[model samples]
Target: RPQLTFEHPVDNSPTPFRPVYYDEKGVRHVGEPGVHPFAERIKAVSVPSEQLLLKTETPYLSLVTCPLTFVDTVEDLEALVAVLLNETEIAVDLEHHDFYSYQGFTCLMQISTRTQDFIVDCLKVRANMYLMAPVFLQPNIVKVFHGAREDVRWLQKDFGLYIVNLFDTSIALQNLHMPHSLAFAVDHFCQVKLNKKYQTADWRVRPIPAEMVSYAQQDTHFLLYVYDRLKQLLLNCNMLLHVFQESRLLSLERYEKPHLDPDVTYKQALGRSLGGLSSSQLQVAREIFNWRDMAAREADDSPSAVMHISSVLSIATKLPTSANEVLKCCSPVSVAVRTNVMKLLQIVKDAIGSA
Candidate 1:
């Protein structure tokens, strides 16, 4: 049985906000709003003709010289969608932050065509992001992405968007016998070095820096050209079909909310060696782990934010019998953990009494 209870999160707003639900088995699931509409229409890949890869290299645009647009409002997004609908191919990438968010979310979505680049402020127009469903779901348009495993899920979870025909460049590199890093691909095709200095930035800031925007643009700006080059190489090797097949599998991945259960979670986190605890001590650890998750859910933050995993192990190992001992067991204490010191000690006492 469970000691704490949670109300199923409700989405009462006009837009979907963290749309997730728990099942009878206690597993969490994401509401796949974008999937059912196109379930029957799903295709593995939209193969382009050999002639499509026949074009000789037109001068690829200089990153510094190409036109760039920042779309934060609905009107600009409407204009961007108009441009995107006519495009035969486009490159896409997303910047996301998880440290502060409970489930994390897309912060910026960067899209680039052969001639222009666009950066959509996901936070500004989060509610209206569904406007992109038509452009994304269009089977005729090839959406080129690199390492789209997480990008596909973020798009679905945040915007109710789905990709129909995706060409993942990492899959191309895997078949080509080259390192699959974006830096390696850019260097091989474009002779440009990618700077990842801002890869760890908290993109949830209201006013992102100019350098950050430039870094984000670089990720997708040269990707289409890279795809063009890879397609030609893949055709020469007769591996285009195979790459498309693998990338299609990646495109089919669905987003699921993080599952929450103390038994499985504790085992995964600290199961290799049980800190050599007795049966009663193990039970105390299990209860502490459960309380940590409960506190985190109630606070609407990550479990780590409530208390570090190591803290749980320490308390369970020592079987803290008093409030001071409970505080001592927390390596790096959080206010949430401190506030519940009495409760934690009481739980330990109960475990001891029951034994």
Candidate 2:
């Protein structure tokens, strides 16, 4: 587990605000309409029956569902907590951004009950992660999600929250050799076509439009319904044990980048796949491989955000000595490479004389 950088968060939002800001540890937050007040509590929202929005108690309701609640402001999250504290199960999903920062991010969370939906503004409710941890941690109330392994990792990385008894509906599909994308699962089973126009939308921005919130609602709105349908069938076939066993295995999972040998790592960079490289080129490749970590740490960004692995590999393999040569060879034209062109050329210049 990554060490948490604990910072004081106040989610009580004022009138107007900046688009982005940071906590003490340089963790960026989206400024917003709500501020989280970590104390006091909302005890109840609605009962499970109506909250699940059953057209009838037996059948799953169609996709033209109930109204969704958008919770970005501090006050709304309190009310949401009131509602969440009562529900037995809910659907969950996340929208995130990677290009925006070194660590990437879990930007927004979509939570849905059977009858209503919610868009939890992660930026505004930083403490909401901690505050609601008990809800997911509790065994009695199942937290339903589709493909939640990555979501659990983000929940761990960003908020130090662990999910217990997580029901990942997508995991059930593997028994039939089926693909497990949420949209695909929905279309195959529920016959609903998701409007994924906002799939690539930037979630790090503030004041997400109402239309976009509606779009996010779809990600989770059908999840609980799916879980219920799957659970019933699995039970009838005496296969419910598989769901429980798989859920337990998944709940213990964590996400971490795997380590690779430096030589192997460098070879994975673009245009380094060939086996005929000379010892001199290999040394240069190794040098860049080591320096990449140094540069990324200094800049507080991902290694690729500070410098492309391919650009470094190209510089090493070609031993591009001059500025024009470096620029001509590397494909990435981003700020990291553009500004450091001369400096990197000097490294290539140095590596040429060695081995």
Candidate 3:
């Protein structure tokens, strides 16, 4: 094999990356960079490893599980509660079946604390585990995540798991005016780049593969390391309090509500409604929206997956007043979808006086 060489000598010194804060004048220098005399000497002798870096093992401090199991069984729920109640700090991450599964379900829940990591299998457990909210809300124990909004929404919608004391790394980066991604922050701050080759691995597989296990572990193993560095950076910038306040507010379960209005769809294609359509046509469009919503909810799928936006809009524009008209005009809609549309129109008609 050929030897690889860099423009700079391999023996070049390492640089000690430090954080600094500035006042309104933006002119405060904490310390001189490259002041660590031996940093360059240390970098020169360092060797890269092929395997992913792992966090040191710690004793189990908390439990993390997915809705697949906790949403189904009470025993699993209690198990989760027991682990959380005993621990002061908890870290959480959820694996969702969005890419491979027909219905999206939470597949894995990785939870950790300063000491330990727990990979909870969600498919086998079922229970109203929403009671675990207060554990997360405790200010004494911080809950850490990368990008937390999607996971937070899932928690609220599925199990009503409200959060508190959240320390979202993604948000922290944005607050610090750094890069928007965890990977970028880790690379820039810690000189570590996470491997995301298995990002789309099948979470629904039984007897999870060793590769998958390792992949999941990598997701949280470095989280604490990243959190430590980011926390120091925030402190250095004198923005720790501001970041904490934002995280606390983000932990609340305030934005999880069912979107029911058909007009909500119009937000995407604003000012594009068919003005030529009669009031009857608009009613048909409303019916299509309602039907898609119900189907999406029932299937645990996105509304777009159930039916395309254009297909739905087309049916509405045609304004099929009669079942036959609806069926004939919207031939592009699948048989299963057409049936639902008719069902929705009938439901709406029964409630209205003239439409």
Task: List model 1 lDDT by residue over 224-296, tens digit each.
Answer: 8888888888887758878877777777777655565655777786775576888887887788888887777
Off by over 4 Å in 1: 1-37, 48-52, 58-60
Clash pairs, candidate 2, are: 11-35, 11-36, 12-35, 13-35, 34-73, 34-74, 52-114, 52-115
RMSD of each: 6.6, 9.4, 18.8
Using all chains and alpha carbons, the TM-scores for the candidates as numbered come to 0.85, 0.76, 0.60
Give me the candidate number with maximum TM-score: 1
All candidates in order of lDDT, best leading:
1, 2, 3
Q: What lDDT score belongs to each candidate, Candidate 1 first?
A: 0.76, 0.63, 0.55
Misplaced by over 4 Å in model 2 are 1-65, 209-211, 257-264, 268-274
Q: How does candidate 3 score on lDDT? A: 0.55
Sorting all predicted structures by TM-score, with the top scorer first, yields: 1, 2, 3
